[model samples]
Target: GPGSMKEIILYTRPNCPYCKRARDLLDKKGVKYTDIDASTSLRQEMVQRANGRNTFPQIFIGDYHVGGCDDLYALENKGKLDSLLQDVH
Candidate 1:
């Protein structure tokens, strides 16, 4: 049940390109999200949260991990992202 949520969380570095795309996409979608700068010590924790991906722009829709910008775009292209963002519990 990969449902939607109004609240989302995004992990990214301040100067990351993919991270920018991620946030820009989300913003364009009119989705509400908390963007965190994972460039600091919290990066390790963020990495663990991403299951060792160690990449910028890790996204979470509700409690579901959405990986990086590519993954996010994949979901969008698949036409699943809007519903997930709209069906927020």
Candidate 2:
């Protein structure tokens, strides 16, 4: 049941390269997303939501935790990202 809704959320900082890539891909996909600046106080919130993983660019597709940049790219590589984004089964 690795499904997702249309809402995409990203926990990111401005200076992060991987975060840029994540944003780039999403932009290319032409989808709207909530991009949070997880630079300071919000980092703790990010950690809590991300299940203790304090990495840059933690991504979520709806209620599903999609992990980091590599994980997101992996989904794209598998050709499942679009369906996930579109909330398709």
Candidate 3:
């Protein structure tokens, strides 16, 4: 799994500040992703996929759960985010 490639998925809402930060980080890093708005009925599958965690910014980078904006920034601060992303791609 570590060596395999996978798409980045972000389950988010329009007004979430954390989601905005996460998006900004991704943009800064030049990372591509798929965003699903949790408020829409069509996103129910994604909501369920989150396992009851209704947080606005649930992120999955190649099957790895990356909780929220702070979680991602923390990983970046520790210099671990790039390595983690490299693992799946």
Candidate 4:
């Protein structure tokens, strides 16, 4: 289980609805993460690091891309999200 722990990172913009939803889900799940506001001046670097896509609310769990809000909710609906979060601890 040594490699089971997952580190979550979220790239978001300040006023994006999808970003808000993603953050709400993580909060409701009691998950902790590092959030980066892509609206900042350093956004270009973050975007490059995140698969070169300028999408709002890009999420990663231990280097595994989790995608956006819809993707996250889909994982939760399939009951796989909890397991992913469990790996974080």
Cα RMSD of predicted structure 4: 3.4
Clashes of 1: 2
lDDT of 2 by residue, 1-89 (tens): 69544667777666777777777877777777777787747755765665555545467665566767778778778997665557312
lDDT of 4 by residue, 1-89 (tens): 36545556777767676677767776776768667776645555665675555544467666466766688678868997665676333
List the candidate 2 regions with Cα displacement exceeding 4 Å.
Answer: 1-5, 43-57, 87-89
**Each candidate: what lDDT?**
0.64, 0.67, 0.65, 0.65
Q: Which of 2 and 4 is ahead in lDDT?
A: 2
Better of 1 and 3 by TM-score: 3
RMSD of each: 4.8, 4.8, 3.9, 3.4
Clashing pairs in 1: 4-84, 5-88
As a TM-score, model 2 comes out at 0.65
After TM-score superposition, the amount by which residue 12's alpha carbon in candidate 1 deviates from its true location, in angstroms, is 2.2
lDDT, residue 82, candidate 4: 69
After superposition, the stretches of candidate 4 with alpha carbons farther than 4 Å from their true spots are 1-4, 39-57, 87-89
TM-score of each: 0.62, 0.65, 0.66, 0.64
> Could you give the candidate ranking by TM-score, starting with the highest?
3, 2, 4, 1
Error of 2 at 87 (Å): 5.5
Clashing pairs in 3: none
Q: Which pairs clash in model 4?
A: none
lDDT of 2: 0.67
Tell me the tens digit of each residue's lDDT in model 1 across 1-89: 79534566677767776677767776776767676777647755765664555554466666566776777777777997665555322
Off-target runs (Cα >4 Å) in candidate 3 are 1-5, 47-57, 87-89
